[PDB]
Design a protein around this ligand. Structure first.
Ligand SMILES: COc1cc(C(=O)NC2CCN(C)CC2)ccc1Nc1cc2c(cn1)c(C)nn2-c1cc(Cl)cc(CCC(N)=O)c1
Length: 261
């Protein structure tokens, strides 16, 4: 069924012009949507009610919206109102024109140490906000760390997020990200899906000899078997890793394809 070329709502009564396709995400599709009056551009999640015919799944999205709506931080994807018609459910969000930290990883492999410091810092700060406000993200990944024209990390995607395992699962995801950034391959990545689950359970990984000792230290603790021995969000920024070597305040857009000089 056709998705309308213009998008209007009974609430705000603003008109959104359906522009260019941006990508898929399960049952969700994203389009660059423009406000027809202000000319302000947004990322519009469009989910059909045909995928939301079930009362069970319909909760997941109304839980996610409720949590995203309450958020306002310079490191979390800006929530900007949701609505629905008979056919589709629409979510209006902050536009991040530089795709995600996944695309960066795939194109760069192992980033330089000062880059990962920067990306981690900005990411961790948003995770602090979340954690301060009783929110656990539960699904932090590179695909979820969105990048804008200023190379600013903005955490999105709360499909599996909850409000109050506890907070220290988010600290684990962050360990993975830091690993994948510094090393260039995910720490538990394998071809077989079931194998991956075993690796996690048994805690099977090894940080290569080539990685900085201080860096491999922070990684190991963020990945520690005992969740209660993982560092708290606040304890991360203060770590030697962020405070030892160079930590740039801004990154060029060139970092998307080539290392900075
Ligand atoms: C304007 O900046 C963007 C560009 C693109 C893009 O160029 N995608 C290419 C288009 C061509 N096809 C062949 C491959 C992906 C994609 C997303 C952009 N921005 C952009 C995307 C955004 C957001 C903000 N801003 C938010 C918030 N959530 N999402 C979001 C949401 C979903 Cl459901 C899926 C994806 C996915 C993946 C993908 N294919 O890259 C992203």
């Amino acid at each position: 069924k056709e998705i309308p070329d213009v998008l209007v709502d009974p609430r705000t009564m603003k008109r959104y012009m359906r522009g260019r396709f941006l990508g898929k995400g399960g049952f969700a599709k994203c389009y660059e949507i423009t406000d027809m009056d202000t000319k302000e551009v947004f990322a519009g999640k469009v989910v059909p009610k045909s995928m939301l015919l079930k009362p069970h799944q319909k909760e997941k999205m109304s839980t996610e919206i409720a949590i995203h709506k309450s958020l306002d931080n310079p490191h979390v994807v800006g929530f900007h109102g949701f609505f629905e018609d008979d056919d589709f459910v629409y979510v209006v969000l902050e536009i991040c024109r530089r795709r995600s930290l996944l695309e960066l990883h795939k194109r760069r492999k192992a980033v330089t140490e000062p880059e990962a410091r920067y990306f981690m810092r900005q990411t961790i700060q948003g995770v602090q906000y979340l954690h301060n406000n009783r929110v656990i993200h539960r699904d932090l990944k590179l695909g979820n760390l969105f990048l804008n024209d200023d190379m600013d990390v903005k955490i999105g995607d709360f499909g599996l997020a909850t409000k109050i395992h506890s907070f220290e699962v988010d600290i684990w995801s962050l360990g993975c990200i830091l690993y994948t950034l510094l090393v260039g391959k995910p720490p538990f990545e394998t071809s077989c899906l079931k194998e991956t689950y075993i690796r996690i359970k048994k805690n099977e990984y090894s940080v290569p000899r080539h990685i900085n000792p201080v860096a491999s230290a922070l990684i190991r603790r963020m990945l520690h078997a005992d969740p209660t021995l993982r560092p708290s969000v606040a304890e991360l920024l203060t770590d030697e890793f962020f405070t030892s070597g160079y930590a740039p305040m801004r990154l060029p857009t060139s970092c998307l394809t080539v290392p900075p000089r």
